């Protein structure tokens, strides 16, 4: 489990920053996104032009232009990011939690941690010589 190389560590932290961008854009996109629309008409000096329109109709043409003539990629950018970064999390997470080769790794790290742990390998690694150990680490090494 602590066998992962460095680039898979970068994959984890870049992954969680990536989904943090996703949840930021999704939240902001829900509560603050709108569109402002008003018609182009032509295609004591300065006075304000006036339209005979209404707050009603502004909200209506807001919804019509916002649904129709706006790009779906700008509509659904955080959802593509969110779903798509879960593809990446499913890559590394699913590769490691594949069942049978995960059993290979679990068995492997169990004998690996004991293989770090054995002080007889400290002894036998450390060196016609003698030296008498005790019993049960012999059994453990058996």
């Amino acid at each position: 489990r602590i066998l992962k190389p460095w680039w898979d560590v970068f994959t984890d932290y870049i992954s969680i920053v990536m989904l943090m961008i996703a949840v930021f854009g999704g939240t902001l996109q829900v509560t603050q996104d709108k569109m402002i629309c008003l018609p182009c008409k032509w295609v004591t000096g300065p006075t304000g032009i006036k339209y005979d329109l209404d707050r009603h109709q502004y909200n209506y043409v807001d919804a019509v232009c916002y649904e129709n003539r706006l790009h779906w990629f700008a509509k659904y950018f955080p959802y593509l990011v969110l779903l798509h970064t879960l593809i990446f999390l499913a890559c590394s997470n699913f590769w490691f939690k594949f069942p049978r080769t995960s059993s290979k790794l679990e068995h492997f790290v169990s004998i690996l941690l004991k293989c770090f742990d054995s002080p007889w390998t400290t002894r036998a690694l450390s060196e016609s010589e003698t030296g008498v150990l005790d019993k049960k680490e012999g059994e453990q090494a058996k």
Binding site: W7, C40, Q57, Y60, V61, C65, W120
Partner: protein, 241 residues
């Protein structure tokens, strides 16, 4: 785009064709979109570096050559192998932990371990209950297929005739000269070629040698320098001229 141009079928309801429409948020989505793809190209670029190591320097037995070249470097030469690519990932973690694994794996090392298991798992009451026999105090690893001699053997000086059929001990510990009562030695079905200064110990100790059923190669040559031997037992020298 920040500022889009809308033109829809609304004119019977509001009476206008074209709508200048500002989207107040596209600059924010634009900058974090560019920040997003910047994050992805850094991400997948490192993934390409993983692939470049996958095709550049990674095989199925390359770490096995690191084991055995490391073992020739580590003075315990002949080490077997178990799968290298998972071992390659821990080779990228540290070769120190690779060194722990191979040094445990060598059969000379675990041979020494089970030899020590023999050394603390033959006890004084065992050979104590194997002491006195036909004429004298005679001990048997004879017909017992033991892999090594116990070290409590040279504990108990009461022994006089030792019986050592079927044992792979090429070496005897030098502390065997503590057995000053031992003078008759049975060394058959074995190849004890001690290579220790204990031969001078038994140069002035013993008088009887038994080399039964021993073939042409398995006659320990350096052993017969002890010039106080008096009787010799050479059954099974199936020898031509």
């Amino acid at each position: 785009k920040f500022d889009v141009d809308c033109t829809v079928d609304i004119e019977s309801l509001t009476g206008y064709r074209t709508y200048r429409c500002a989207h107040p948020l596209a600059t924010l989505f634009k900058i974090l979109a560019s920040f997003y793809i910047s994050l992805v190209i850094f991400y997948g670029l490192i993934c390409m570096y993983t692939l470049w190591w996958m095709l550049r320097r990674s095989l199925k037995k390359y770490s096995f050559e690191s084991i055995r070249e490391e073992s020739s470097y580590s003075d315990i030469p002949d080490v077997k192998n178990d799968f290298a690519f998972m071992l390659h990932l821990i080779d990228q973690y540290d070769p120190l932990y690779s060194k722990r694994f191979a040094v445990f794996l060598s059969e000379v090392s675990e041979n020494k371990l089970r030899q020590l298991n023999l050394n603390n798992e033959w006890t004084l009451d065992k050979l104590r209950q194997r002491l006195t026999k036909n004429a004298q105090d005679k001990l048997e690893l004879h017909l017992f297929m033991l892999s090594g001699i116990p070290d409590t053997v040279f504990d108990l000086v009461e022994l006089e005739v030792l019986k050592l059929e079927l044992i792979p001990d090429v070496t005897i510990p030098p502390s065997i000269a503590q057995l000053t009562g031992l003078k008759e030695l049975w060394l058959y079905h074995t190849a004890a070629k001690i290579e220790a200064p204990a031969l001078a110990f038994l140069r002035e100790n013993l008088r009887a040698l038994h080399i039964k059923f021993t073939d042409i190669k398995e006659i320990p040559l350096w052993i017969y320098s002890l010039k106080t031997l008096e009787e010799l037992h050479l059954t099974g020298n199936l020898s031509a001229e």
